[PDB]
Amino acid sequence: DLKCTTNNMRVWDCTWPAPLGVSPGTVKDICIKDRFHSCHPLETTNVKIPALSPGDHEVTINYLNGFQSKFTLNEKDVSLIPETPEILDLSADFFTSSLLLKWNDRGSALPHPSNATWEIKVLQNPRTEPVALVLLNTMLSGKDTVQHWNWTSDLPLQCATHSVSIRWHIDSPHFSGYKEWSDWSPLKNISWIRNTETNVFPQDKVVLAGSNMTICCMSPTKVLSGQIGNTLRPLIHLYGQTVAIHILNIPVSENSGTNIIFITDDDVYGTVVFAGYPPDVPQKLSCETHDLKEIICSWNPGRITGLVGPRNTEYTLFESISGKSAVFHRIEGLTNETYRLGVQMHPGQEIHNFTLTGRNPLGQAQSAVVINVTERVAPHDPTSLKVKDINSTVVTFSWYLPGNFTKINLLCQIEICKANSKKEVRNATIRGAEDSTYHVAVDKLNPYTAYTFRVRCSSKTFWKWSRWSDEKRHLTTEAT
Amino acid sequence: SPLPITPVNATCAIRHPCHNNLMNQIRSQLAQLNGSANALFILYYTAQGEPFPNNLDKLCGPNVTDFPPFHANGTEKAKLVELYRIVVYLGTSLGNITRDQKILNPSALSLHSKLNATADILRGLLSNVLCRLCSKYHVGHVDVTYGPDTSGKDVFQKKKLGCQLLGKYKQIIAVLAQAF
Numbered sequence: 109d110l111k112c113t114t115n116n117m118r119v120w121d122c123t124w125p126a127p128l129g130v131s132p133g134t135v136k137d138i139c140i141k142d143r144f145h146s147c148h149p150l151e152t153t154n155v156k157i158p159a160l161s162p163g164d165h166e167v168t169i170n171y172l173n174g175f176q177s178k179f180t181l182n183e184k185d186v187s188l189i190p191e192t193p194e195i196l197d198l199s200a201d202f203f204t205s206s207l208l209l210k211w212n213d214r215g216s217a218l219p220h221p222s223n224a225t226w227e228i229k230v231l232q233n234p235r236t237e238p239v240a241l242v243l244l245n246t247m248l249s250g251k252d253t254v255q256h257w258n259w260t261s262d263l264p265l266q267c268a269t270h271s272v273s274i275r276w277h278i279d280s281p282h283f284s285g286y287k288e289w290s291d292w293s294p295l296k297n298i299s300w301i302r303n304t305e306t307n308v309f310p311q312d313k314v315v316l317a318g319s320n321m322t323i324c325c326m327s328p329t330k331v332l333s334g335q336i337g338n339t340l341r342p343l344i345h346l347y348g349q350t351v352a353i354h355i356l357n358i359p360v361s362e363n364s365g366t367n368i369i370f371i372t373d374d375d376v377y378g379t380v381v382f383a384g385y386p387p388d389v390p391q392k393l394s395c396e397t398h399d400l401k402e403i404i405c406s407w408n409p410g411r412i413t414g415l416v417g418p419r420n421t422e423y424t425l426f427e428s429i430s431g432k433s434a435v436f437h438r439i440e441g442l443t444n445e446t447y448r449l450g451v452q453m454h455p456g457q458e459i460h461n462f463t464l465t466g467r468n469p470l471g472q473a474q475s476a477v478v479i480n481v482t483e484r485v486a487p488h489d490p491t492s493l494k495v496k497d498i499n500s501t502v503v504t505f506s507w508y509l510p511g512n513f514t515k516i517n518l519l520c521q522i523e524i525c526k527a528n529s530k531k532e533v534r535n536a537t538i539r540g541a542e543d544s545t546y547h548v549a550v551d552k553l554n555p556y557t558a559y560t561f562r563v564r565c566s567s568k569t570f571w572k573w574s575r576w577s578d579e580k581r582h583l584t585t586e587a588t
Numbered sequence: 589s590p591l592p593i594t595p596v597n598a599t600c601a602i603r604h605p606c607h608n609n610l611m612n613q614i615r616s617q618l619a620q621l622n623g624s625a626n627a628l629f630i631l632y633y634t635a636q637g638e639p640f641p642n643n644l645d646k647l648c649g650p651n652v653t654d655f656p657p658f659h660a661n662g663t664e665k666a667k668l669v670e671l672y673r674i675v676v677y678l679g680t681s682l683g684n685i686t687r688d689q690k691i692l693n694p695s696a697l698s699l700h701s702k703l704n705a706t707a708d709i710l711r712g713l714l715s716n717v718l719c720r721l722c723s724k725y726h727v728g729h730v731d732v733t734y735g736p737d738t739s740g741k742d743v744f745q746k747k748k749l750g751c752q753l754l755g756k757y758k759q760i761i762a763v764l765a766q767a768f
């Protein structure tokens with residue numbers, strides 16, 4: 109019969125109507141029997157009391173002259189209308205057209221494990237909001253929490269200023285009365301402080317090929333047309349001749365980027381957007397070595413991402429066990445052709461864990477390979493063949509083959525081609541070394557005849573042959 | 589990389605000396621640029637993507653203001669000094685318009701080739717022009733202004749500003765190369 113309220117679950121704000129028969133503001137005590145015999149003073153018919161023990165209690169109210177009122181009060185008459193929480197800050201990103209909202213969970217003032225829920229609510233300039241969405245939030249007793257909400261602008265890019273709001277509702281399994289909805293926070297306003305001349309948003313953005321993206325236009329002059337690459341779109345008034353269009357679904361711009369332009373009677377305000385494919389899992393990946401100084405990795409780009417320079421993918425090759433690594437970035441666009449990346453290796457080593465990571469401001473892609481270097485030795489082509497006489501029937505055939513080959517040994521071939529005969533091919537092995545000339549004794553020849561030599565090399569563990577040499581071509585020799 | 593380049597600090601003190609004839613070189617050189625012009629402008633706007641060729645006058649309007657004056661008559665000196673500025677002016681900005689296209693349209697070798705030669709020849713006309721503006725004229729140093737693009741910011745604008753500049757160039761060379 110004595111209707112109550114509370115902001116937190118600590119103190120009851122209880123008011124009763126006066127006992128009719130001219131007794132007005134002649135109020136002395138209001139007494140409660142709970143914990144102890146406590147008695148509170150009065151100025152008028154309502155008062156601020158400490159929340160008591162669940163159950164029924166004798167609440168008597170004394171009036172000055174004679175009377176006194178006898179009131180049965182509980183926990184389940186009381187309603188819990190929480191305080192208005194205030195928005196602490198409203199830092200806003202402009203690059204990404206997005207909002208951050210941070211407030212004080214006054215959890216310091218609300219007892220024990222208690223699930224409480226928030227109706228946040230945004231808005232721009234139209235008669236209603238973009239978003240009004242609700243957060244689950246369980247509350248930690250005692251410790252105030254500093255909880256966030258990271259929302260992002262569906263539509264424009266802050267060219268049109270936003271308001272935000274938040275009401276919260278507490279529950280408690282250790283409270284009994286009508287768990288009630290609080291009320292709306294005093295609204296919070298964020299705004300553009302015009303940075304540049306520019307009047308159309310957003311500039312220079314890169315987006316996923318075929319992306320339902322929205323773009324807007326701050327204008328002085330009633331805007332007549334809005335179009336991406338001659339396909340004008342039906343444009344929609346936002347507020348002050350400042351207007352916006354939807355790019356339905358976007359085809360991947362070329363190198364120069366797709367242009368979206370607006371025209372008013374007077375001037376022309378416009379914007380470039382780049383439409384992209386993230387890089388594709390790089391393809392036919394296989395590394396080898398022609399020298400034993402450095403490893404090289406062949407690979408194919410894949411689907412070409414349609415983008416250029418800064419945006420063109422940046423392939424990075426990473427030897428794990430080494431730590432050593434290198435980088436690829438071509439300004440011109442990529443092909444169906446295959447490119448190679450020139451990584452160093454510390455002497456010998458062997459075990460090799462390769463990670464090729466193509467990055468491009470939209471997504472990542474990565475394939476790996478694992479290589480026993482000394483199993484990939486597939487050397488350059490041998491050069492500068494000199495031939496030196498020993499006897500009539502024998503010659504010293506020698507060349508120079510680039511590469512650290514001191515650990516390994518190579519076996520080479522000698523196409524001793526003589527005139528008008530079958531190709532005599534010889535298979536002899538030699539000990540290799542540091543960027544060095546190699547020497548072969550060649551025998552069982554014919555004195556004074558039309559010889560021609562070819563050399564062709566690989567490691568005795570062999571990956572693949574050298575190319576075929578050049579042409580040595582020499583005669584033989586006599587006695588007298 | 590291909591390097592265009594137009595000198596600002598020109599001086600009868602420091603400049604590169606020249607061959608013979610002079611006037612009839614800068615006549616030839618002048619009206620030569622006039623040739624390329626159209627096609628190089630075509631080429632520019634062409635690859636700036638749609639809808640650039642269909643709004644050719646609203647976007648690539650022969651317009652960019654603050655532009656170095658030219659007067660029709662007056663003594664060789666006037667014509668020559670005046671020209672000199674215009675030259676300084678384009679080649680300054682013209683370099684930039686390239687250093688742009690160098691990363692926006694790095695595929696049209698077709699465009700660079702032009703852009704690049706239209707700088708080379710432009711540089712010549714310069715030394716050749718002052719080379720006369722120094723032999724029986726003695727100004728000492730033509731005082732000058734620098735072209736557009738401090739930033740320019742937006743890709744977009746950088747296209748318009750280049751589409752506009754090229755527009756006037758096209759519009760201006762056609763006078764220049766007739767007058768003297």
Ligand SMILES: *[C@@H]1O[C@H](CO)[C@@H](O[C@@H]2O[C@H](CO)[C@@H](O[C@@H]3O[C@H](CO)[C@@H](O)[C@H](O[C@H]4O[C@H](CO)[C@@H](O)[C@H](O)[C@@H]4O)[C@@H]3O)[C@H](O)[C@H]2NC(C)=O)[C@H](O)[C@H]1NC(C)=O
Binds near residue numbers: 458459480482
């Ligand atoms: C990269 O690959 C290379 C080339 O295969 C590899 O170097 C090779 O290592 C193996 C062992 O890992 C060597 O083979 C051995 O040679 C000697 C004989 O001189 C023996 O110790 C071994 O015999 C035993 O193991 C055999 C296994 O097949 C058995 O058949 C045999 O009964 C024995 O139990 C074995 O034959 C080989 O000599 C080298 N290759 C050369 C010539 O250098 C290397 O391990 C790989 N990368 C690295 C550096 O780990």
Ligand SMILES: *[C@@H]1O[C@H](CO[C@@H]2O[C@@H](C)[C@@H](O)[C@@H](O)[C@@H]2O)[C@@H](O[C@@H]2O[C@H](CO)[C@@H](O[C@@H]3O[C@H](CO)[C@@H](O)[C@H](O)[C@@H]3O)[C@H](O)[C@H]2NC(C)=O)[C@H](O)[C@H]1NC(C)=O
Binds near residue numbers: 500501
């Ligand atoms: C040209 O020389 C070759 C051999 O070349 C040999 O090796 C060089 C690197 C030099 O050090 C030379 O001094 C040396 O000759 C001659 O053919 C070779 O002849 C020798 C002598 O007969 C052979 O050695 C013989 O081996 C047999 C056993 O097989 C013994 O019974 C002998 O005692 C003798 O030592 C050698 O095997 C043979 N080499 C080949 C590839 O057949 C070649 O006769 C000579 N010709 C000319 C024009 O002088």
Ligand SMILES: *[C@@H]1O[C@H](CO[C@@H]2O[C@@H](C)[C@@H](O)[C@@H](O)[C@@H]2O)[C@@H](O[C@@H]2O[C@H](CO)[C@@H](O)[C@H](O)[C@H]2NC(C)=O)[C@H](O)[C@H]1NC(C)=O
Binds near residue numbers: 224225244246
């Ligand atoms: C914490 O509370 C949520 C939601 O509480 C509701 O919102 C209040 C304002 C009021 O409407 C109450 O009646 C609701 O309980 C609980 O999630 C709900 O659970 C119910 C029942 O399963 C379900 O039908 C709803 O769809 C849920 N809504 C949401 C927002 O999730 C949630 O179970 C509570 N969490 C804990 C830890 O107890």
Ligand SMILES: *[C@@H]1O[C@H](CO[C@@H]2O[C@@H](C)[C@@H](O)[C@@H](O)[C@@H]2O)[C@@H](O[C@@H]2O[C@H](CO)[C@@H](O)[C@H](O)[C@H]2NC(C)=O)[C@H](O)[C@H]1NC(C)=O
Binds near residue numbers: 320354356
């Ligand atoms: C990409 O956008 C299309 C179209 O979006 C609709 O039209 C816009 C002007 C805007 O008002 C949006 O809110 C609209 O939804 C989406 O295609 C529509 O998808 C819905 C739900 O699947 C469907 O009911 C409609 O029939 C679709 N319209 C047409 C003509 O296809 C599409 O789903 C979006 N893609 C995504 C997932 O981003």
Ligand SMILES: *[C@@H]1O[C@H](CO[C@@H]2O[C@@H](C)[C@@H](O)[C@@H](O)[C@@H]2O)[C@@H](O[C@@H]2O[C@H](CO)[C@@H](O)[C@H](O)[C@H]2NC(C)=O)[C@H](O)[C@H]1NC(C)=O
Binds near residue numbers: 410444
């Ligand atoms: C990329 O090329 C491959 C290989 O084809 C050859 O080499 C190319 C680099 C190119 O220069 C071609 O002219 C050469 O013919 C193409 O491989 C084909 O792939 C399709 C689909 O997987 C398959 O049906 C064919 O059999 C392949 N062709 C043959 C016979 O090798 C591939 O199509 C190219 N990829 C792209 C993205 O276009």
Ligand SMILES: *[C@@H]1O[C@H](CO)[C@@H](O[C@@H]2O[C@H](CO)[C@@H](O)[C@H](O)[C@H]2NC(C)=O)[C@H](O)[C@H]1NC(C)=O
Binds near residue numbers: 200201206207258
């Ligand atoms: C809200 O969250 C988003 C993404 O979770 C944040 O955007 C990221 O910001 C960092 C720092 O520069 C970068 O990794 C990217 O720019 C963003 N990543 C995403 C999500 O794409 C954003 O900063 C948050 N909002 C605020 C105001 O801090």
Ligand SMILES: *[C@@H]1O[C@H](CO)[C@@H](O[C@@H]2O[C@H](CO)[C@@H](O)[C@H](O)[C@H]2NC(C)=O)[C@H](O)[C@H]1NC(C)=O
Binds near residue numbers: 271294295296297
């Ligand atoms: C934040 O700005 C908004 C709007 O600019 C203010 O609330 C609106 O103010 C306009 C103009 O004063 C009124 O006509 C409307 O009644 C308000 N609109 C809404 C959505 O209620 C608000 O007063 C400002 N608040 C702060 C904290 O600065």
Ligand SMILES: *[C@@H]1O[C@H](CO)[C@@H](O[C@@H]2O[C@H](CO)[C@@H](O)[C@H](O)[C@H]2NC(C)=O)[C@H](O)[C@H]1NC(C)=O
Binds near residue numbers: 455514
């Ligand atoms: C060429 O390769 C050889 C090894 O294949 C290098 O010689 C080795 O040097 C290291 C020093 O770290 C020693 O541990 C080894 O004992 C050496 N011997 C070999 C052959 O393994 C040589 O330094 C390499 N040359 C260069 C500098 O590339």
Ligand SMILES: *[C@@H]1O[C@H](CO)[C@@H](O)[C@H](O)[C@H]1NC(C)=O
Binds near residue numbers: 428461478
């Ligand atoms: C190679 O390194 C990668 C690191 O991502 C790891 O996944 C893998 O286990 C390693 N394997 C070998 C062969 O060392």
